[PDB]
Amino acid sequence: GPKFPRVKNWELGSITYDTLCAQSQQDGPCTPRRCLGSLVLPRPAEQLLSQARDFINQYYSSIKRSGSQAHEERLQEVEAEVASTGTYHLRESELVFGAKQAWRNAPRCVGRIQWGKLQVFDARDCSSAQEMFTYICNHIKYATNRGNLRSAITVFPQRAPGRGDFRIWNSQLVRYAGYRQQDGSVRGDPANVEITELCIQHGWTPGNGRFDVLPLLLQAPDEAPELFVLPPELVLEVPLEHPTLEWFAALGLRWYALPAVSNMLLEIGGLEFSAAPFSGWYMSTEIGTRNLCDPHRYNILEDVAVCMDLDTRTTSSLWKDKAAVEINLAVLHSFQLAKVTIVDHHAATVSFMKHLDNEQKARGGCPADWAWIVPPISGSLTPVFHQEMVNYILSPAFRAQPDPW
Amino acid sequence: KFPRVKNWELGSITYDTLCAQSQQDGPCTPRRCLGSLVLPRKPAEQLLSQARDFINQYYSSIKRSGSQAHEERLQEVEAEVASTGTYHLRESELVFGAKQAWRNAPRCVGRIQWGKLQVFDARDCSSAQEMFTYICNHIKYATNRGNLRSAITVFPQRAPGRGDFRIWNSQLVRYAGYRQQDGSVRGDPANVEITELCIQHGWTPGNGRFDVLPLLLQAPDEAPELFVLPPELVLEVPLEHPTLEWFAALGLRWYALPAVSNMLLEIGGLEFSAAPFSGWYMSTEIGTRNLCDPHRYNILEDVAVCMDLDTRTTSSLWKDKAAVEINLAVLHSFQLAKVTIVDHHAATVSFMKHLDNEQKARGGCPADWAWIVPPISGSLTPVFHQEMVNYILSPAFRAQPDPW
Ligand code: HEM
Ligand code: HEM
Ligand SMILES: Cc1ccnc(CCCCCO[C@H]2CNC[C@H]2Cc2cc(C)cc(N)n2)c1
Ligand SMILES: Cc1ccnc(CCCCCO[C@H]2CNC[C@H]2Cc2cc(C)cc(N)n2)c1
Ligand SMILES: C[C@H](O)[C@H](O)[C@H]1CNc2nc(N)[nH]c(=O)c2N1
Ligand SMILES: C[C@H](O)[C@H](O)[C@H]1CNc2nc(N)[nH]c(=O)c2N1
Ligand SMILES: [Zn+2]
Structure with a gap:
């Protein structure tokens, strides 16, 4: 057969070959000696330009103008900007395309059938922790939409040479407090002990319930993070x-x-958006x-x-x-x-099967992490359990990043 | 680099060093992970080094590593390969190798039991009739009126000249699957092909949902033979x-x-094409x-x-x-x-204990997360929250082609 991985669905007997994986420019953690697929976190001008050229090429293909004059002009414009400043900046429509493509590329997400429908809020003008808060509140309002949820991402300014990062310290925009008890147990969500304690170190007056909504710790460049309480009427x-x-x-x-995930880095064409919170349902x-x-x-x-x-x-x-x-x-x-x-x-898994078929035709494959896609109850009752998957890193991508503290 | 392996429920961490003992490549590469694939698409000197490695494992297991007996056994193996291109295991080595093949099986959640395996040596088998007699004794022994006892029966090894000893059926007990002109299946759709091979080789079919199939048993270079299991042996x-x-x-x-009957058992470079094994x-x-x-x-x-x-x-x-x-x-x-x-x-609680035992004993345990986590209530079991490293050690159980 073809020299690309063969991928079988054992329920239906059907076979595909993943050719998309050939586009991976970034190694995962596995080798021929041992598979590390189940690990949660397995642990520059020429380089930037090559990631940027690749991404601009992806963009021009997506709008069907590869080899066009506008394509060659953009490429030159990107190398000139990098040439003279060491970085470059995305056009609005490039950012929208890249944000959607990062989602489409996320191997751990079973909701990717929705990938084309993402409201991208461009917040690259943001210049303070207070303004991040406004942007975030608007994001929450738009996305929540009184219960008829809409997928969205808000993108704050990119990482810059020698200037500090925009960061949301909280792992999600909504998080319940976790209060460590004298007996060593936890009231509330044990996932959030550290962030809870950090909020208290930064002046938050703690509650003592099991479902206390935490405030946000927002950090603009080269400043201590500032603490912001979400108006309760925003948190459905x-x-x-x-x-x-x-x-x-x-x-x-x-x-x-x-x-609404808030601690992930969005990478597009070598540019790094350290604060780019995204939400779905x-x-x-x-x-x-x-x-x-x-x-x-x-x-x-x-x-x-x-x-x-x-x-x-x-x-x-x-x-x-x-x-x-x-x-x-x-x-x-x-x-x-x-x-x-x-x-x-x-x-959700039925819809992901539809997504896999759509992506087979559009791109010749879909990067997917089987352990994350198969639900934690009733695994083999869902069609995805019987579906072989190929996992690999494409860019644009959402990546984990270190905690700011 | 030795992988760090984390349990996310308890926060504990180990490092797998056993993976360095792997001499056999899996399907993954740095560019893409194929860990979810059920069967990925994959000379004297090479047999000799697998043989020596295995004999070393054995003498180390009985603590007599470096003894007279160890060095003479290596010479025997060497003398035999040099002269004939192959060699033969002593029964005690076979028993060690079979237990080790189970221990090494990454898809098996039941490995806490690995040391407790009854090994029946059936290498003096020269006919399909003889294989049937051995299989019947295996079934009787392992079944034990419901008090199941793990066992393996090892038929003669592959030899360069000739065809393999094979059990055509994928397990010793299988229910028939009868295809309909209208496409559908009565019985077990997993067994449509084997059911049809049985009929074509002379079996009179039933027409129920749970008809126990006969065995198709094959001695080298001969047509397979049909044997009906006595109903009394099949609990x-x-x-x-x-x-x-x-x-x-x-x-x-x-x-x-x-009782799985289609896998190849590999010990010391030797290959046992028919070596049915059972547990519960x-x-x-x-x-x-x-x-x-x-x-x-x-x-x-x-x-x-x-x-x-x-x-x-x-x-x-x-x-x-x-x-x-x-x-x-x-x-x-x-x-x-x-x-x-x-x-x-x-079972998953017992496997967690096994992981710990194996960490202390061997510095790791190869395990295939997708197979270890059960198909209902995954995250309700401790193994869901346990990182695992998967790699091939020998002795091993392997899949092999269907003999038809
Ligand atoms: C529209 C509805 C959506 C559903 C139902 C959904 C579903 C999921 C689920 C079930 C997970 C696994 C999370 C876990 O086990 O903790 C996940 C992971 C993820 N999804 Fe989605 N998803 C949606 C939208 C989105 C959107 C809008 C984005 C980005 C724009 C996204 C990116 C991700 C990423 C990056 C992960 C991996 C998170 C990590 O590794 O920490 N998904 N998705
Ligand atoms: C003693 C009780 C045992 C239990 C409870 C047990 C449990 C399991 C389970 C649940 C599986 C996955 C099977 C599936 O999903 O179809 C499995 C696979 C396996 N176990 Fe066991 N096991 C036992 C004994 C044994 C023994 C005695 C051997 C060999 C001597 C063995 C070798 C294997 C192998 C090779 C596989 C993989 C089969 C394949 O890839 O087709 N296990 N085990
Ligand atoms: C947009 C959307 C739609 C549906 N669900 C969600 C929530 C996803 C929550 C992701 C939480 O993941 C965390 C907590 N459990 C494993 C871990 C994975 C992980 C680990 C680390 C160090 C960083 C990171 N970004 N992601 C988000
Ligand atoms: C000893 C023991 C204890 C508990 N259970 C068992 C039964 C194991 C049955 C394994 C059958 O596996 C088959 C059917 N489903 C995936 C598939 C894996 C597989 C595929 C192929 C082509 C060959 C093979 N040996 N194994 C055996
Ligand atoms: C160790 C293992 O990788 C880990 O527990 C994974 C398994 N699958 C998962 N799948 C999803 N969707 N989310 C998770 O947090 C996890 N945890
Ligand atoms: C495609 C996927 O690898 C396949 O369905 C696997 C998943 N996990 C499994 N786990 C066990 N124990 N047995 C199986 O047959 C399977 N099937
Ligand atoms: Zn892998």
Whole structure:
């Protein structure tokens, strides 16, 4: 056959070959000796120009003018700018294209069928921590849209030679506090202990609830971060109830509507946007399985199993499985009742299969990380489990970056 | 570079140094990871060095590393390869090698049991009839009236001249799958091809959902022969549900003994083309994959209807809820029948202990995350949150071509 990886779907028997991976210019962590695919984080003028030329080429292909005069002129303009200043700057429409392409390129995202529909807010004029806050509030308002969620990204100024970065210190725009107790346990979300403590070091008066919304720590170049409280009316939340287990509401659980990642670096043509928060909507398992049932998160499985009167003293009762299903159902039901956009893991994986087919035809492949794409409950009940995937790094890309402190 | 390996639930970290012992490349490269692929597309001196490496493993295992016996065994192996192009294992080495092949299998969640393996040496087998006798004794031994005991039977090694000893069936117990002119399948769609090969070689088919297939057994360079397993040797479990009474009416069942019969066992460069092995099931293999895969028995919808679930929308989680009850029924039914089984929580907890044992013993453990994490409730098991490094060590179990 072809000398490109063969990719099989074992449910349907169908075969594709991934040719897109040939475009990867960046190595992942695997070698012929050992696969490191399951690791969460596996650990310059000529170089900038070559990433920039590549990206400008991607742009001109996307608008079907490769080899055109406007294409050759832009290339020259980019080399001249880099030549005389050591950097360059994107056109508005280049940034929109690059932001969408980073999403389309993200191997860990099951929601990529939506990739073409992203509102890009250009905030490259931002010059202060206070203005970042305004931009972020506008982002949250637009994206939340009273529950009819819309995908969006706001892009703050790029990294610059010798000047400090724009950074949002919080990992997400909405995060529940995690308060360390004298006995060593945690009230609230244990994922957020560090950010919670940093907010308190920077003058935040802490609450003491399990769902206290954190303030934002926003950092403009070469300044200490400044603390900003989100007006509560901007943060849509959904109290959790279950459709037939009437006691579930009494548990006082809730989650926020807007999933907005704020700690990732957006890379386009070698340019680095260190503050570029992006948002979409939730797949129900993120809330109902990971955030609520991880042992190191809210860890509510046993509490729910006891309310359901399950035998929690033995693994073979499948008490964990039964409780998790009911908690996932509660999440779906509560978001539906509240008219807030959410997608269940069956619908989301079906839509990703459609995405894979669309991308096979458009680009000859789709970079995908199987362990991240397969949902954390009911894996083999979803079509993606039976689908082989090829994982590789394309650019434009969203990348993890070190914490600013 | 030795990988750092993190558990994200506990925050603990190890470094895998065992991977440096790998002499066999997987499908990944720095440009793209192919870890999710089920089978990626992939002389005396080379046999001699695999042979020496293996003999060293063995003498080290019995602590007699560097002894008279060690050096004379290396000379024997060398003398034999130099003269004949091949060599032969002593039974004690075979037993060590088979256990090590299991220990090394990255897709196996059950490896806490790796030291406890009954090895039947069947290298004095010269006919399909003889293979059948050995397979029947394996089944009787391993089944043990429901108190399942792990075992492997090792038939004669591949030899340069001639055809292989092979068991054509992928497991020793398989249900027939009867294709219909109208395309559909009665029975197990995984076994349509093997069912058809059996008929073509003379089997009189049944017409039920759970007809146990005969074995097609092949001695070198001969047509395969058909053998019907005595019904008494094949322990089966009727499936019922502890509370839902209609569930038994579905007429469902599964066999006790998972015995894989199509993999090649490689020890010291020698290759055992027929070396069936068995343990016991993890319940999700039956309750989730075999019964709920859409390309297997595909019973989710039927169960969901029996439960009166709302089937018209994904967001009712009807699939999830039905899958759970089906898994519960498998566990309940094996327990009631006193047939060994392990649930996915207990199995993954045992595998975590195994990882720790292996860290102390060998400085790592090769494991394939996609296979170790169960197909329901992944993140509810400890293995979901555990980083894993995958690589090929020898001795090994490998896939091999179908013999037809
Ligand atoms: C429109 C609805 C969307 C859905 C349902 C969705 C779904 C998901 C899910 C379920 C994950 C896994 C997260 C986890 O396990 O913690 C994820 C990861 C991700 N998605 Fe999305 N996605 C959406 C939109 C977006 C958008 C708009 C972007 C960027 C513009 C994006 C970029 C990402 C990235 C970069 C990751 C990886 C995050 C990381 O590694 O930390 N996705 N997506
Ligand atoms: C003692 C109880 C055992 C349990 C509970 C167990 C569990 C499992 C499970 C759940 C799988 C994945 C199977 C699938 O998804 O279809 C598996 C695969 C495997 N196990 Fe075991 N195991 C056991 C014993 C053994 C033994 C005795 C051997 C060999 C001597 C072995 C070697 C393997 C191999 C080679 C695979 C991979 C099969 C393939 O790639 O086709 N295991 N094990
Ligand atoms: C836009 C959208 C749509 C739906 N869901 C989301 C939320 C994604 C949350 C991502 C959280 O990922 C974090 C927490 N768990 C694994 C870890 C992965 C990771 C690790 C690190 C060091 C950095 C990073 N950016 N991402 C976002
Ligand atoms: C000892 C033991 C304990 C518990 N379970 C088992 C049964 C294992 C059945 C494995 C069958 O695997 C088959 C069917 N699904 C993926 C596929 C992997 C595979 C594919 C191919 C071509 C060959 C092969 N050997 N293995 C055996
Ligand atoms: C160790 C393992 O890589 C890790 O727990 C991964 C597995 N798959 C995941 N998949 C998603 N979508 N999100 C995650 O946080 C994780 N965690
Ligand atoms: C494509 C994917 O690798 C394939 O469906 C794998 C996933 N994980 C698995 N895990 C186990 N234990 N058994 C399997 O057959 C599979 N199938
Ligand atoms: Zn890999």
